[PDB]
């Protein structure tokens, strides 16, 4: 299934694997928005990736994730230039996308790709000492949004419980249960 707008949560996702699936999707004429890019993960411990950046200048993981894709797409080709603008990488979950579903990519999930006991690095933690100086405010927004979202979930859960009780109380439900519904 593909949509005109797709929101992908970057928490617990490998950078390269996430970059690959979005690179193909972007060439497919699809708009993809990436949120919480600061919580991306890269195989290899913290010092190695720190040395990698020291050899390498954009401090935003949203820019870094965009930069990784930029060299992973035909940038010279005008088609690649057009597809670049269809990708929107932002840190955290902004209000224009907080009230929308956030899907995940199985091919990039750390739990499905990383062996237990393997060291890994977090981009937001990595970027904190390279020029980024907004971790507190970015974090502060995260708990504020999730607290509001959790309250929304509780209201939705209560509504789901009420309708579920109403659904079971409905005699119509088991009239034609032979269809598996």
């Amino acid at each position: 299934e593909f949509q005109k707008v797709v929101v992908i949560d970057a928490k617990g996702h490998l950078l390269g694997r996430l970059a690959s699936v979005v690179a193909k999707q972007l060439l497919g004429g699809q708009k993809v928005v990436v949120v919480r890019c600061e919580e991306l993960n890269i195989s290899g411990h913290f010092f190695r990736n720190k040395l990698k950046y020291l050899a390498y200048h954009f401090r935003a993981p949203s820019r870094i994730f965009q930069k990784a894709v930029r060299g992973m797409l035909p940038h010279k080709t005008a088609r690649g230039q057009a597809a670049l603008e269809h990708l929107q990488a932002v840190e955290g979950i902004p209000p224009p996308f907080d009230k929308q579903k956030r899907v995940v990519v199985p091919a990039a999930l750390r739990v499905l790709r990383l062996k237990p006991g393997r060291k890994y690095c977090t981009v937001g933690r990595l970027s904190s000492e390279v020029g980024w100086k907004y971790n507190d405010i970015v974090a502060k927004l995260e708990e504020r949004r999730k607290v509001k979202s959790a309250a929304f979930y509780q209201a939705k859960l209560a509504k789901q419980k009420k309708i579920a009780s109403a659904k079971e109380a409905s005699p119509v439900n088991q009239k034609l249960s032979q269809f598996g519904y």
């Binding site: 299934e1 060439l27 497919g28 004429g29 699809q30 597809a83």
Partner: protein, 106 residues
């Protein structure tokens, strides 16, 4: 506006090509819900179409359609090879192609 859509959405990926040589006679189409070569057998023979609009009002309408036909599968991920009456423009990469259900074999 629930209803209509007697076809299946599909995306026009690219042409049949080597690493550097492209043959634009046939184009790769990725149909939704098709994810294996054995599955693409069902869509072999269907009539695919490209639908686009233009400023000129021809016959009182504003729609131009380039018909086509699915021919063979392409790889293990459900892609297909479709030949059109007019070869698709190279700009329509990553667009929508409407795979209607005829000629039906079911």
């Amino acid at each position: 506006a629930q209803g209509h859509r007697l076809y299946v959405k599909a995306k026009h990926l690219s042409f049949q090509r080597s690493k550097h040589v492209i043959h634009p006679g046939t184009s790769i189409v990725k149909i939704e819900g098709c994810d294996s070569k054995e599955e693409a057998q069902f869509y072999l023979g269907k009539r695919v179409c490209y639908v686009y609009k233009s400023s000129k009002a021809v016959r009182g309408s504003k729609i131009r359609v380039i018909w086509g036909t699915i021919a063979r599968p392409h790889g293990n991920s459900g892609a297909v090879r479709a030949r059109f009456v007019h070869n698709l423009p190279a700009k329509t990469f990553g667009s929508s192609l409407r795979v209607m259900l005829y000629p039906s074999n079911i």
